[PDB]
């Protein structure tokens, strides 16, 4: 199952910039969800870009 770092993602919460100006996506993992909201790097968050698209949908974001 969960081999290490990438626990069972419920969904993407949100995204932000790092103090070094890097893309971190606030991801929640199931079981804690709301109080889980943890900042995972873009290039390690998920093997599926569908989750990133889900963020753009749930935040109601006109981006093209």
Q: What is the DSSP track for the chain? A: ---SS---EEEEEEEEE-TTS-EEEEEEETTTGGGG-EEEEGGGS-S-THHHHHHHHHTT----
Domain 1-64 in CATH 2.40.50.40? The answer is yes
Q: How was this structure determined?
A: NMR
What's the CA gap between 18 and 51, in Å, rounded? Answer: 20
Contact 29, 9 (CB under 8 A): yes
What's the CA gap between 17 and 23, in Å, rounded? Answer: 5
Contact 21, 2 (CB under 8 A): no
What's the CA gap between 39 and 42, in Å, rounded? Answer: 9
Domain residue ranges in the chain = 1-64
Termini Cα distance of the chain? 36
If you count them, how many residues does the chain have? 64
Torsional class of 9: left (φ above 0), alpha (ψ -120 to 50), beta (otherwise): beta
What's the CA gap between 9 and 17, in Å, rounded? Answer: 20
């Amino acid at each position: 199952g969960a081999s290490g770092d990438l626990y069972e993602v419920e969904r993407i919460v949100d995204k932000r910039k790092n103090k070094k100006g890097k893309w971190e996506y606030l991801i929640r993992w199931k079981g804690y969800g709301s109080t889980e909201d943890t900042w995972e790097p873009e290039h390690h968050l998920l093997h599926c870009e569908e989750f990133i698209d889900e963020f753009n949908g749930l935040h109601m974001s006109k981006d093209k």
